């Protein structure tokens, strides 16, 4: 039984936009939960993101974790912008809406709901458990259920 809640998360999409999906996996209590679901109009880089909200909003108590992804997105998003758009008011340079703010102001809420170590990957050498995330990611994407509403072409 895991003294930390471990998290996997990966993000596909077969266009800009397209139908994409996540994959995540979390190891909480003493279980191992599988999230997955497809969208038929997004981008990779939301899909990242929301792999990472679903799997951290299904926490019900603050928890000390451990987040395990490959994603560039999320990693830039957290060590160089996520800072400054908290400051600024979640605004660009040019004082318009940062992009994706819906998923990056949800993420945040849930971030600061638990004590998170980042565990960056890469690509090709993740764990078995990051490969399995890929695979669901992958297969969502090929039969989407749901409507990513805040998408835009957009802001």
Known sequence: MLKQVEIFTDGSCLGNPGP??????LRYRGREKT????????????????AAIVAL???KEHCE?????????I??????????????????????????????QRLDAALG?????????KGHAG?????RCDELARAAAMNPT????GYQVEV
């Open 20 to 25: 994409g999906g996540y994959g995540a996996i």
């Open 35 to 50: 999230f997955s679901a497809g969208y038929t109009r997004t981008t990779n880089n939301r899909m990242e993101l929301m």
């Open 57 to 59: 909003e299904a926490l």
């Open 65 to 73: 974790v451990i987040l395990s992804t490959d994603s560039q997105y």
């Open 75 to 104: 990693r830039q998003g957290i060590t160089q912008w996520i800072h400054n758009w908290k400051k600024r008011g979640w605004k660009t340079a040019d004082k318009k809406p940062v992009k994706n703010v819906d998923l990056w």
């Open 113 to 121: 709901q638990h004590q998170i170590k980042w565990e960056w990957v």
């Open 127 to 131: 764990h078995p458990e990051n490969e």
């Open 146 to 149: 749901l409507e990513d509403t």
